[PDB]
Structure formats: structure tokens, C-alpha cells
């Protein structure tokens, strides 16, 4: 069961640094390479660098000179990348990937979101979206004015999922807004409670909004 488990989302400051972690399990860490790959919002993939934890060899990308240093702790089977001299356009999802000569990037971590910004962390407001006069009924939640990404949004603690649309966050000034809709049989609601559950890890915020009819 090969697994690459990466650290959680980050908020980094312009000019500063951030260290990312990638803990390997299910295979022999020192028998494979380990690459970092970056991906900007609505952009493609970019290879940052690779280190071989067994031998300590590092393959470099001159484009990241002074911006990335790769290390590894053989003891804990964990790989690190230190991203430095950060600027706003270094905001991206950063993946680690097991890198083999036989197959390539066969296994990937889940990715670590890194936001580079001087803006302050802001907890979201969560507002219920109760339908108006108008066979199925659609309800929603509006998650407004938070920073940084990400938030998690679920409906009835995950029980409802098949009728759910959660929309990508849009950034306005230094605050994100997100929304989510859930469509259910007109027989279900309101004679059955529907609640959206929002978590914002950056502010340790959790908020529930039970959708009640107008």
C-alpha cells in the first residue's frame, strides 16, 4: 500500500519561506527518487527538483535557484522541500511523487496548497440559501469573506452527496467567496433537516447552517 502523505495547506508571506513535508510509507523510501511538482491555479505542471534519499543525490532545476532546497530524513521516511524567496506567483499546489527509472512518477502525494500573500487570515461567514416560491427543491449555502483557501463543505455530515454542487472559490479583494447547492426530492425537505457543514482549517472555524423555509 504505497502512500505519500503531504502536510496541510500553508499561508506564506512574500519574501519568506515555507517547508513542505511528504511522508512515504508502503515501500522502501531509499530505493526510489522523490520529485516535487508544482501547479498554479488554472495552469499546468512544473518539475521543481528531485532528491534520492538513499544516496543523497539531487537533480536540480536552475529555474528554482534560490527558491527550492530538497532534503530527506531517512529515519522517518519523510521528504522535505524548502521554498524560499516566495512571491505571490509561487502560490500553487505542490505535489511530491515517487520517481523511478523503470516507470516514472507512478505514485503521487495528495498535494499541498501554498498561498503566498500578506493578507490576514479571515474566518468565513456562512449563510443559508432558502428557496422561494419556485418536483425537486434546491437549497444552498453561501460561504463568504474568508482567507486563505481552503474550506471544506459537506451536507448533512456527508450523507447527501449525489445532488450536491460545490463551486470553486472566487477571490475578491483579499477574501474568498464560495457557494454550494444541494438538490433533493420535493418530498424530503422541509419535513427532514438539511444542514451544510463548513470547516475553515486556517481559522479553526466550523459552522453549521440548517436550511429552514422562508
Partner 1 sequence: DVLMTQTPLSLPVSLGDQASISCRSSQSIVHSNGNTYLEWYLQKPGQSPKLLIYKVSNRFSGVPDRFSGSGSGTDFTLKISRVEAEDLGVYYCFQGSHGPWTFGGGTKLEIKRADAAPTVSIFPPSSEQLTSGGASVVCFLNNFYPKDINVKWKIDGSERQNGVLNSWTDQDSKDSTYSMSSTLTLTKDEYERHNSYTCEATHKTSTSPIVKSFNRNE
Alpha-carbon distances, residue 161 vs 16, 41, 158, 189 (angstroms): 39, 25, 6, 15
Give the other-Cβ count within 10 Å of 114's Cβ.
20
Q: Are 137 and 189 in contact (CB under 8 A)?
A: yes
Q: For partner 1, how many residues bind (rule: CB under 8 A)?
A: 48
Residue 109, interface with partner 1 (CB under 8 A)?
A: yes
Residue 133, interface with partner 1 (CB under 8 A)?
A: yes
Residue 142, interface with partner 1 (CB under 8 A)?
A: yes
Residue 158, interface with partner 1 (CB under 8 A)?
A: no
Residue 167, interface with partner 1 (CB under 8 A)?
A: yes
Q: Which residues, numbered 174-213, are part of the site for partner 1 (CB under 8 A)?
A: 177-179, 181, 183
Residue 127, interface with partner 1 (CB under 8 A)?
A: yes
Q: Are 182 and 140 in contact (CB under 8 A)?
A: yes
**Identified binder of partner 1 from the candidate list 44, 135, 191, 204, rule CB under 8 A:** 44
CA distance 72 to 60: 15
**Identified binder of partner 1 from the candidate list 1, 89, 132, 157, rule CB under 8 A:** 132
Amino acid at each position: 500500500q504505497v502512500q505519500l502523505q503531504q502536510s496541510g495547506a500553508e499561508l506564506a508571506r512574500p519574501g519568506a519561506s515555507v517547508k513542505l513535508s511528504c511522508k512515504a510509507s508502503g515501500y522502501t523510501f531509499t530505493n526510489y527518487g522523490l520529485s516535487w511538482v508544482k501547479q498554479r491555479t488554472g495552469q499546468g505542471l512544473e518539475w521543481i527538483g528531485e532528491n534520492h534519499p538513499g544516496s543523497g543525490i539531487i537533480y536540480h532545476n536552475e529555474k528554482f535557484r534560490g527558491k527550492a532546497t530538497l532534503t530527506a530524513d531517512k529515519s522517518s521516511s519523510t521528504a522535505y522541500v524548502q521554498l524560499s524567496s516566495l512571491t505571490s506567483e509561487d502560490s500553487a499546489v505542490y505535489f511530491c511523487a515517487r520517481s523511478s527509472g523503470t516507470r516514472g512518477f507512478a505514485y503521487w502525494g495528495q498535494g499541498t496548497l501554498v498561498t503566498v500573500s500578506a493578507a490576514k487570515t479571515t474566518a468565513p461567514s456562512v449563510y443559508p440559501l432558502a428557496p422561494v416560491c419556485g418536483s425537486s427543491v434546491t437549497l444552498g449555502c453561501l460561504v463568504k469573506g474568508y482567507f486563505p483557501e481552503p474550506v471544506t463543505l459537506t451536507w448533512n455530515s456527508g450523507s447527501l452527496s449525489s445532488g450536491v454542487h460545490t463551486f470553486p472559490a472566487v477571490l475578491q479583494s483579499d477574501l474568498y467567496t464560495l457557494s454550494s447547492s444541494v438538490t433533493v426530492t420535493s418530498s424530503t425537505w422541509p419535513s427532514q433537516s438539511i444542514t451544510c457543514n463548513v470547516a475553515h482549517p486556517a481559522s479553526s472555524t466550523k459552522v453549521d447552517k440548517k436550511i429552514e423555509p422562508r
